Design an enzyme around this catalytic site. Structure first.
Site, mmCIF file in Angstrom:
data_model
loop_
_atom_site.group_PDB
_atom_site.id
_atom_site.type_symbol
_atom_site.label_atom_id
_atom_site.label_comp_id
_atom_site.label_asym_id
_atom_site.label_seq_id
_atom_site.Cartn_x
_atom_site.Cartn_y
_atom_site.Cartn_z
ATOM 1 N N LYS C 159 0.885 -1.293 0.106
ATOM 2 C CA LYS C 159 0.085 0.085 0.142
ATOM 3 C C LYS C 159 0.899 1.216 -0.116
ATOM 4 N N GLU C 185 1.883 5.589 10.249
ATOM 5 C CA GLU C 185 2.455 4.778 9.113
ATOM 6 C C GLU C 185 3.994 4.602 9.507
ATOM 7 N N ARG C 186 4.793 3.800 9.113
ATOM 8 C CA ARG C 186 6.440 3.335 9.296
ATOM 9 C C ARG C 186 7.116 4.729 9.029
#
Lengths: 329, 50, 464, 451, 464, 80, 78
Positions: C159, C185-186
């Site tokens: 994604k 999110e990362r």
């Protein structure tokens, strides 16, 4: 290379376990030396003096609504006591304990009477009907404000009525000038019910008829104020530990003088020459007048240990021995 | 590998004999040092001369 | 006058106030932490009123080092973040403090994080097609310029590579403003975006807000509303068309689920908060574009355990105009970008808006791929030669259409080594109109894989 | 010998000093199963370390209006109601430093290998926040694992997080112990930029498995640079929950100093099970799968705190290899799919591949490394630059064509190339290839010389 | 002064003490039951401190007839069990009372059943292979001398037939001492084992500890710790090599779940206790071989509902050096011992430990059985013939290997009447080498059922 | 004994417009004390111009769900 | 000292009937019965029996055997 490192780590574990052994032998010999040295009373007096000089150099349990309502109730009790007298105050405290028993038993009445509400008039009218013939008017005048205010739980009404009955009873000691006597008896009863673990657990009789505990106190356990406080407290005990309740009575009694209680531990018999300095330095440290509950014990030999509030200052041959022996490499 | 493992086992035996002789020799002096060390610590635990 | 902390239990903090001084819902409260390297001002948002002048709060920063009975002062207003042209080309956290240059935003106009969505009178449906140049997106899931687009997908189905490609395709040519929200999110991909936007010089028009997954549930919630209230400034006060990227919008509702038990809400189906559709709706409705002022939302939605029956995906699907829908099944076949052609959908895909030549072709591709998924069970056990000549021809077309929906993306330079490609919409329709009528059944099946349109398909087939 | 042995204790005795400063004391009022509730302590901080009287430490997780919900980090058997508890004046922290290299330690950073005391450099708080987006750098230099099936196809870079997810007994510890062993040829250079330090966090391993890993590292020389943070399954769920943070803090100290670090977490599913036990004894409402709500914010806060730093922070890095045990080989499970979304790639070790001779057993379809060809030397980006897509398309075509009576000329050529690549990516344990041997090995496959 | 019972909740008894006299954890507490035919002294073990000097205890006898308010006397030490060389040859309950003659062992050295596991400095890995003489075990699941071994299985697949086989394989010729823990298994098996060991003359060198099904969950869990305490004394003080059979160690964690729901701790996944992996850990780590001294464990592990993902099997799987996963599917074929070759595993099946040839053969067998299990989805529909020839050649030898992993066990004679067989490791490797190379594809599948070695395969093939 | 029963009955029987006050508010619910004559499903009105449904009636409080603009509710608001 | 010990013995020296305080769906709780054994068979006024399972600090949690419809608040239990 793995062999050369294996030899180095074997040598290192040999000189390590050598240091652990030399350290263990040195600490255990030093413990024998200090335990012998602590046998002189001049050495104990020198240790408490070195601690005292070092120290020289160095409602809140209730939720908001109950706290605010208790402060307002105590603010009205101040007005009641200002025109009270000892023969009136002893009756006020017994009558307030009687209504606290009534609320504690008729838990339907208590659940309704503790209902948090601003339009509190129906609760006051219930109390007026139920009590106006049974009990004197000055208790009704104080229970009107106790009921008209807001409580965080149906328990905290009973806790406020009990506390007000305790305050009314303490006020006799404060007006008669027995306050130092009743404090000393409450600490005496607090230490004995802490050293006597059978009778105090049987005095936690909130699963049994309270009059049996009232008779037990009348047989086993004096200033009539302290006896009245103990009997009122065991009547209303509601599953608190009996010794911890008596200690909390003594904490309230000292807090009425604006002071606080430091529990103190020593080898034995801290002399009055120590006690006057110890009170003075504790007062300088904590910014309040103080009282000392001397709990002398031979296991904590040498130095002085103290505890007051949540905090402690704990200098003793035992506590410093543990600090030295745990610090071995 | 087997020659080096034999050299390592010989080195481990020479260590076991060296450390046995050293551990007995140093404990001979340590038995005398422990009295002075405990005398020093009996002062540092009391917080005064002894 | 000020309040005090009463109870602390993970990120949730109870605070008691004087009778008259209780703060309104969603006020920011400040409390000080005073130990060592943890020493910070702590921001709490008022989540509930408990009664007895207590309020329950969620901490925007870790509660480590917080002490019972510390003083708490209410700010008198909600959490507020800087808004204005001068937030473009900077990186912010959920509180609206700049990460790159601490204190940068302090002279700006500050807007409250919380506001109502626009009134129903102000809404009109959007029907302009956005062209991205991705074969599978422009054919089967055509995006709406001013709509609410999404990239659904399980864990790890790519994604974030697809959203970074969508930034690189749309926001590179786009003449307006862009915002990027980092919601749980990362952080590595937050930095790889930040340096990529600086290198492509797009950063001069992009405001980034990051509330990455190393942050407590309070900030993973309020970061999505913070980035959104920068996009709502560019929409409302400036009327300059906006892009709003959000990776990962699921983390908003997840962080809500993590606090809900400590907030004393009872857990719902599969352990979400009960307010799920009312929290998510109150966020998603603000992302809409009113008449005369577009926000092109692009929000990647995580799907727990790949289960598209999971309440968070299932509630999110209502708020969207074009849902690209990634899957581990298509990913495990190497058909990166991993878009599931049959699950994925768009409201703009009708013959009134895209035109019959697009619509017919999208429907013939979906019909073929659907008949292929009906046939995979038979093909795995009975075997391809058993089938009818018409079914077996359709299977040999579906296996080519599957691969020709895969594309060498410009963000996947590191995944593939070859540079990326853009396929125009007209060439996409022509290529799939040929494929569905069999005009490429003579080409080897491998020749379609990862290839950027017909010119590259021809060059690859003649390379084999 | 004897003069240093006596002298060290003489310096200790000379340094020994009074503890006559005040401290706050609580008292335990409830205890059992590894939890205790502490009455009092009016000023204790959230996640403060508490000193109980048996030497044992705990952490204050809940602070109620009149009670503190402490978790006990040790032998809770000695805890009982009524005994005193002192505050430490210290947020939950562990000692760190170069002295941890080659040691086996509790999650409190105290030794259990039975060698001497650890000469710790400083304390580090376990909860110091991750390096923000402006402090990180693009992962751009490789960890060589020596495993063809990883370094050529799911590459690991310095500052990657690579999830070695798989079923039970599929080589997850073998991949990670081989990765830690392979770093010796770089360590011996003495150059702080090539030199990689390692940490192996054993969570809920049996003690003889940790002693097997330890001697596998001693045989290959890896205990010269590896710390083992052993929470063996015997110890209470406090240590088993904490062990990943003690590994992460010991790692972070070298990382922030400009060293390169590798962390292996073995296993994060057993940290999630320990945190469930701890949370259910503290009576927090369970979320889904009975896990606490914040079981994501257990693993995200753990793993997101490892990444490559900017040159403005010495340019150090920490690389995480978390391990997960997938119960019945489902990748689509709650804890698996959390850690798959926190990390930067998967090496899904399928037990069905592992049995059919394909060892290391990487499921080339589902496994991925999202850093890709930034975590490879140029020569590997040349020879392997699409090898995962070629092998996943091969496994798709081999599943499809498993029953076709015949195949097209190109389909035959692909299905016969894939079998050369799969046999080329098989590798026996303890045979690490140098990268200069891996690039040639892959060159034989991808150019078709093996055809 | 001493305590009083306050609350009773089946086998869990809450007792209060005086303010100071509160016992430690795991102390044994005596109480009296004084009604009719069930009058008994009651042994309580302290599991928690509730506060207010209350301690929550687990009862080691059924509590029926226990009154509230009865006196409870602290013994000031844990549950202690007799240990010594004179413990061998007798049968004990969890509390260390001999069943045969209750006056026995009260004068021995008693050890507290709660002990710390050996420190990490004293653990070392064990790799010496144990010769059992069972084909599937010695080939694919080689057992470890001084390791932990487990026999997983559903209900009625043969876990206890394998345990009473392994008692004949090992504990007869094994020069050391054997301990057998009966943990929640049938009292009927506890008798048929006790009288079998008396007949085989093995009883002179084994001690049996039984906590069979009819016992309350307190003793059904503490029996395993009592038997392990007897084995720890034989290991440490006598210096013996020990065998420690434990059937069934799932009942240890089940009895731990039953008391945990009565202690009122919140339920975990599928209603196990929290601390499941800490209660299982604290048992399973004490049962280890320290550097000087081996203890060959062997644990039957039940699997509830055949659900191999169930938290108890899934927790205990980590503690083991060799696991023999028995299966319903293989049992339905009549392929006793019913070991599932692809699920079972051993840590010592490495070429550095078993040798190159044995490892090579075991991987060829596992590859063949893996390919066969991955064809089973086609086999179930079409049968064997519809496969390709390279697969059909494989499946014919896979069925022969699958059957040649069966054996006529020494324990099976009581069911089949046929005698048992022992196959040495050399003959096992040779036979499976010949089977996987394809020397025996001409023999019918019925020739391989329940047969010991090549000479007996030849004899059976002649009989057909 | 009997006097407490008669007096509680007369208190409950003792129960212009009726006023309540909010005592709890969170997540779209607001618990209202007072309103002794409230009926289940009655529209309450709160002083910001907000409505709630009085969907749950307890011994001492009314659990009213809130129909809109819920952020405008506070503890101590007068509910009609 | 000795007076306290003797008083504790005297308090310890000092056909009891309980009452139902809750009933529902098959179970009932009984107040009183301080001397009831766990798993004692209890009898309710309608001739119904119950099993004293959960003996709490102030209540006895009885499972009802047979027609629990005949059980209600304030019934004498012996």
């Amino acid at each position: 290379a793995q062999g050369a490192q294996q030899i180095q780590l074997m040598r290192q574990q040999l000189i390590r376990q050598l240091r652990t052994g030399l350290g263990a032998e040195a600490v255990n010999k030093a413990a024998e030396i200090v335990r012998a040295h602590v046998a002189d009373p001049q050495a104990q007096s020198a240790t408490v003096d070195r601690f005292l000089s070092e120290l020289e150099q160095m409602t809140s349990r209730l939720r908001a609504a109950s706290r605010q309502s208790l402060a307002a109730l105590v603010e009205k009790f101040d007005s009641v006591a200002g025109g009270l007298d000892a023969d009136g105050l002893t009756n006020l405290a017994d009558e307030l304990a009687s209504v606290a028993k009534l609320l504690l038993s008729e838990t339907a009445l208590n659940k309704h009477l503790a209902e948090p509400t601003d339009d509190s008039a129906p609760k006051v009218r219930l109390l007026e009907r139920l009590l106006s013939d049974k009990v004197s008017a000055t208790t009704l005048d104080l229970l009107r404000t106790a009921v008209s205010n807001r409580w965080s739980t149906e328990s905290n009404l009973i806790d406020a009525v009990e506390h007000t009955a305790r305050l009314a009873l303490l006020k006799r000691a404060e007006i008669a000038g027995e306050v130092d006597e009743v404090e000393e008896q409450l600490f005496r009863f607090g230490r004995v019910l802490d050293a006597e673990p059978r009778l105090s657990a049987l005095l936690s009789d909130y699963t049994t008829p309270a009059e049996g505990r009232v008779a037990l106190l009348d047989k086993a356990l004096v200033n009539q104020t302290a006896a009245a406080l103990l009997s009122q407290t065991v009547g209303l005990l509601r599953g608190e530990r009996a010794d911890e309740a008596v200690i909390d009575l003594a904490e309230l009694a000292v807090s009425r003088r604006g002071e606080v209680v430091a529990h103190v531990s020593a080898a034995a018999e801290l002399s009055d020459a120590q006690r006057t300095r110890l009170t003075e330095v504790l007062s300088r440290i904590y910014g309040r007048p103080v009282s000392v509950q001397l709990h002398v014990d031979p296991e904590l030999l040498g130095g002085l240990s103290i505890t007051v509030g949540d905090e402690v200052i704990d200098g003793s041959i035992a506590s410093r021995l543990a600090a030295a022996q745990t610090g071995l490499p | 590998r087997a020659q080096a493992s034999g050299e390592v086992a010989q080195t481990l035996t020479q260590a076991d004999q060296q450390l046995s002789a050293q551990g007995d020799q140093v404990r001979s002096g340590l038995e005398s040092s422990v009295d002075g060390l405990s005398a020093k610590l009996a002062s540092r635990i009391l917080g005064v001369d002894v | 006058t000020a309040g005090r902390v009463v109870r602390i239990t993970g990120p949730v903090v109870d605070v008691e106030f004087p009778r008259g001084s209780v703060p309104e819902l969603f006020n920011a409260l400040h409390a000080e932490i005073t130990f060592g390297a943890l020493a910070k001002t702590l921001t709490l948002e008022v989540a509930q009123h408990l009664g007895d002048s207590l309020v329950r709060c969620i901490s925007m920063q870790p509660t480590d080092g917080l002490v019972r009975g510390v003083e708490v002062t209410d700010t008198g207003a909600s959490i507020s973040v800087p808004v204005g042209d001068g937030v473009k080309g900077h990186v912010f956290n959920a509180l609206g403090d700049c990460l790159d240059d601490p204190g940068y935003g302090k002279d700006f106009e500050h807007w409250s994080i919380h506001r109502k969505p626009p009134a129903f009178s102000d809404l009109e449906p959007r029907t302009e097609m956005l062209e991205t140049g991705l074969k599978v997106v422009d054919l089967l899931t055509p995006y709406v310029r001013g709509g609410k687009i999404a990239l659904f997908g399980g864990a790890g189905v790519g994604k974030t590579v697809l959203i970074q490609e969508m930034i690189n395709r749309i926001a590179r040519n786009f003449g307006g403003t862009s915002v990027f929200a980092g919601v749980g999110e990362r952080t590595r991909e937050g930095n790889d975006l930040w340096v990529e936007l600086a290198d492509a010089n797009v950063l001069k028009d992009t405001a980034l807000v990051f509330g990455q997954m190393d942050e407590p549930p309070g900030t993973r919630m309020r970061v999505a509303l913070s980035a959104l209230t920068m996009a709502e400034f560019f929409r409302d006060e400036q009327g300059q068309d906006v892009l709003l990227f959000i990776d990962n919008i699921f983390r908003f509702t997840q962080a809500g689920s993590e606090v809900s038990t400590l907030l004393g809400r009872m857990p719902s189906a599969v352990g979400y908060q009960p307010t799920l559709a009312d929290e998510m709706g109150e966020l998603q409705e603000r992302i809409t574009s009113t008449r005369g002022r577009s926000i092109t939302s692009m929000q990647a939605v995580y799907v727990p355990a790949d289960d598209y029956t999971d309440p968070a995906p299932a509630t999110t699907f209502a708020h969207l105009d074009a849902t690209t829908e990634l899957s581990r099944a298509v990913f495990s076949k190497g058909i990166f970008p991993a878009v599931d052609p049959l699950a994925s959908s768009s409201t703009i895909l009708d013959p009134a808006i895209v035109g019959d030549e697009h619509y017919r072709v999208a429907q013939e591709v979906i019909r073929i791929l659907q008949r292929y998924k009906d046939l995979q069970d038979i093909i795995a056990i009975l075997g391809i030669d058993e089938l009818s000549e018409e079914d077996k021809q359709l299977v040999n077309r579906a296996r080519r259409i599957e691969r020709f929906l895969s594309q060498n993306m410009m963000a996947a330079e590191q995944f593939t080594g070859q540079p990326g490609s853009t396929v125009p919409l007209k060439e996409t329709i022509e290529a799939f109109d040929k494929l569905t009528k069999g005009e490429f059944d003579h080409l080897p099946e491998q020749a379609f894989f990862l290839i950027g349109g017909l010119d590259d398909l021809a060059k690859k087939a003649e390379s084999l | 010998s004897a003069a240093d042995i006596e002298g060290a204790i003489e310096d200790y005795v000379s340094s020994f000093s009074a503890d006559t400063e005040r401290e706050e004391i609580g008292t335990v009022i409830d205890a059992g199963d590894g939890i205790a509730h502490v009455e009092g302590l009016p000023s204790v901080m959230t996640q403060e370390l508490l000193e109980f009287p048996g030497g044992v430490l705990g952490v204050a997780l809940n602070l109620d209006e009149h009670s503190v919900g402490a978790v006990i980090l040790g032998e809770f058997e000695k805890i009982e109601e009524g005994q005193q508890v002192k505050r430490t004046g210290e947020v939950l922290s562990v000692p760190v430093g170069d002295a941890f290299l080659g040691r086996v330690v509790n999650p409190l950073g105290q030794p259990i290998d039975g060698q001497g005391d650890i000469a710790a450099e400083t304390r580090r708080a376990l909860e110091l926040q991750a390096p923000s987006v402006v402090q990180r750098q693009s992962v751009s230099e490789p960890l060589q694992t020596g495993i063809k099936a990883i370094d050529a196809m799911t590459p690991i870079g310095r500052g990657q997080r690579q999830l070695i997810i798989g079923d039970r007994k599929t080589g997850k510890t073998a991949v990670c112990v081989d990765t830690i062993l392979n770093q010796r040829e770089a360590w011996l250079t003495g150059d702080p930029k090539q030199q990689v330090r390692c940490v192996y966090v054993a969570i809920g391993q049996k003690g003889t498995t940790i002693a097997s890993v330890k001697r596998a590292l001693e045989e290959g020389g890896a205990m010269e640079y590896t710390t083992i943070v052993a929470a063996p399954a015997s110890d209470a769920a406090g240590f088993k929950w904490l062990a990943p943070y003690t590994g992460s803090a010991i790692g972070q100290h070298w990382m922030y100093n400009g060293k390169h670090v590798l962390i292996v977490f073995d296993d994060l599913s057993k940290q999630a099970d320990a945190y469930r036990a701890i949370s259910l004894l503290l009576r927090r409402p369970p979320g889904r799968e009975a896990f606490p709500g914040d079981v994501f914010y257990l693993h995200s806060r753990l793993l997101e705190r490892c990444a490559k730093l900017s040159d403005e922070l010495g340019g150090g890095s920490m690389t995480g290899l978390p391990i997960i045990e997938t119960k019945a080989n489902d990748i689509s499970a709650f804890i698996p799919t959390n850690v798959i979304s926190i990390t930067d790639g998967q090496c899904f070790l399928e037990s069905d591949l592992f049995n059919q001779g394909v060892r290391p057993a990487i499921n080339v379809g589902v496994s991925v490394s999202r850093v890709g060809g930034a975590a490879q030397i140029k020569a590997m980006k040349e020879v392997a630059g699409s090898l995962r897509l070629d092998l996943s398309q091969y496994r798709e075509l081999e599943a499809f064509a498993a029953f076709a009576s015949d195949l097209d000329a190109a389909s035959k050529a692909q299905l016969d190339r894939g079998a050369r690549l799969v046999e080329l990516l098989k590798q026996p344990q303890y045979s690490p290839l140098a990268v200069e041997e891996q690039v040639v090995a892959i060159f034989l496959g991808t150019q078709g010389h093996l055809d």
